[PDB]
Amino acid sequence: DLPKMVEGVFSSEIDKQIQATTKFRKLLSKERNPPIEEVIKTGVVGRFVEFLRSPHTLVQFEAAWALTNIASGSATQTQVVIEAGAVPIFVELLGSPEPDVREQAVWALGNIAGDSPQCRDYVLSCGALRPLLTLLGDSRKLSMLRNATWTLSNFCRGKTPQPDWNTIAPALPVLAKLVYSLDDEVLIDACWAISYLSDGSNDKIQAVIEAGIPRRLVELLMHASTSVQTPALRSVGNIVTGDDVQTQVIINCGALPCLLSLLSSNKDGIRKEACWTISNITAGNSAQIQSVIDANIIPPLIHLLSHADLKTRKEACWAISNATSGGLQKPDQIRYLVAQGCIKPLCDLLACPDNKIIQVALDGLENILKVGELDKNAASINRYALFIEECGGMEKIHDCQTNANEEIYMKAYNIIEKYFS
């Protein structure tokens, strides 16, 4: 009964303290509607934090568990725990001699850090990372590995703002190891954590590369579990947003055959993601476009330009359009894209409700044309302009002249003025 429990918590006797606190732990453990607020109203959160420094590990544990589940509630409920000064103590408890106390401290810090980026940063400010990274390297207990990895992902997670880089960066070596874990759940949280850190500028990508992480990520693209594949894919995608040499690391770890496979994944998200990743590889140099061609990725893409949802058609559009970048250096590539039937599905997208997509399809089609114009002058017509005319594409370019986006209509005009006078 609630007021007797309050009495127990404020008793100075360790056994009264422990019976009471356990009852609170159990009540905050309810599956449906834990009365977090009623508990908070009683005034005991301050006590639970005192209990965190008792020499009796059991009350440390029960207190930590109660606190963990208050911090599992709303932002204001979490803040009550933060206000009480629990976080610097939880960091001390990462060094407790008693493994369950350490684990519960890890768990509490996960929940607190998970409430928001500001909260995340607060926890990092209290020196949480280093002792967490240590537990991750030493512990053999699977539950602790699961918990500490998940909590590590919460330390990495968030963009408004992102964690300070030098502060969170030491996580990379530990994550490089956790992705070889034999546990699926560790694998998942590790991969998510990596995808948060790899989402950034090229220097951050570089740090991921030099931790040695790319090789195992690519291998995890083909993991049985879509829950593993998704964040591993996300991370590989992030990497190839880097420069050409950084992108080349991903090619050299054999990602292209995996990306070819992932195009046929049963999850829409993975397919869409796979296309986005490929588009950033075909945004690269001539040789990297050629890699995508030699991997037979182009036909599935061109197929996806017509099939599956619009978000998919959008990403495939970027991928194919990007691939038309080297008409000057290696025009053989465009002629290959044309021969695999890219023109007609590109023309279709000119009527896309998204203006960026219209521009991307228009760009691709201008590059297609310039090669046909080079083949024309070395022969007598531009056969690419002809196929664009008779497939109905010329009329769709014509309609782009009524588009208001300056980039779009001016681009559409010159194509008509140049290849369709």
Binding site: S195, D199, G237, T241, G242, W276, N280, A283
Partner: peptide, 6 residues
Amino acid sequence: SKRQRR
């Protein structure tokens, strides 16, 4: 050149 987000 290259598209972020993510």
